[PDB]
Ligand binder design. Structure first.
Ligand code: T4T
Length: 268
């Protein structure tokens, strides 16, 4: 007559495998090097080749095509929009989330999605580049740094986060619970039922703590390491939103998708 925390951890893991198109095992298989291998984007020639195959509509406009950096930023946004959709369905697996008022579900997703995006991005990153386009491209870290300002400033802080996050050697069973804990933060601005959310947070963090104790017996400070990573992600998102606002004010061609504009509105 007790909560079965091991079963809850497995439920969360299975919901993560079901709802995210990319998982760390899938990513590692691709990154390791037989059908539809990723096209390597390391310079402008290879960017433009990859676009013609993978996002043909975006480059079908002739001299009306947007600048390379703006096309890349558009693809960044499309990736976020898709991951927002996956996170919204995943959150239904978190005990108590679907019982919250709709407005509180919206608030938790509003503040949590980018922290979750950057945590999970680590799974497709290595020190040399990252998988993109549903695992069909590999874009190099050096190519992204070569873009004109301000677009070269988007990804590098995310690689820096990811290299340290990946050194923790989490697997999908850990990351799924970490993402659920990100979503269940009771201190988000504007929440109505803080008390119930705090209890939901306490429950999922308890599951996470017990799971890490079992799955990582070698790293006795893994749970507090991950609490700190959650705080680091909040700062990474605040900084990312500031850069996006610079782009919005100064780059007239870099249209911001309406779903992401709403996420950013009144965020920080
Ligand atoms: C041809 C393929 C080119 C692909 C270009 C790279 C795609 C990067 C995906 C990660 C996006 C990071 C999202 C943060 S930037 C946009 C946002 O704020 O949502």
């Amino acid at each position: 007559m007790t909560a079965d925390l091991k079963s809850l951890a497995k439920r969360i893991y299975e919901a993560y495998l079901k709802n995210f198109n990319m998982n760390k095992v899938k990513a590692r298989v691709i990154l390791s090097g037989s059908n539809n291998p990723p096209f390597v984007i390391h310079d402008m020639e290879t960017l433009c080749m990859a676009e013609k195959t993978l996002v043909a509509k975006l480059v079908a406009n002739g001299i009306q095509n947007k600048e390379a950096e703006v096309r890349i930023f558009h693809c960044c946004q499309c990736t976020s929009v898709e991951t927002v959709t996956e996170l919204t369905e995943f959150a239904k697996a978190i005990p108590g989330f679907a019982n919250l008022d709709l407005n509180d579900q919206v608030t938790l997703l509003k503040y949590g999605v980018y922290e979750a995006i950057f945590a999970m991005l680590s799974s497709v990153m290595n020190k040399d580049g990252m998988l993109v386009a549903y695992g069909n491209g590999f874009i190099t870290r050096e190519f992204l740094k070569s873009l004109r300002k301000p677009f070269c400033d988007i990804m590098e802080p995310k690689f820096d986060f990811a290299m340290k996050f990946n050194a923790l050697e989490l697997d999908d069973s850990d990351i799924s619970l970490f993402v659920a804990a990100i979503i269940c933060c009771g201190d988000r601005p504007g929440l109505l039922n803080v008390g119930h959310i705090e209890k939901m947070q306490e429950g999922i963090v308890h599951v996470l703590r017990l799971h890490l104790q079992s799955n990582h017996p070698d790293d006795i400070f893994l749970f507090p390491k991950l609490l700190q990573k959650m705080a680091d992600l909040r700062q990474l998102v605040t900084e990312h939103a500031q850069l996006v606002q610079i782009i919005k004010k100064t780059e007239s061609d870099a249209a911001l998708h309406p779903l992401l504009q709403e996420i950013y509105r009144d965020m920080y």
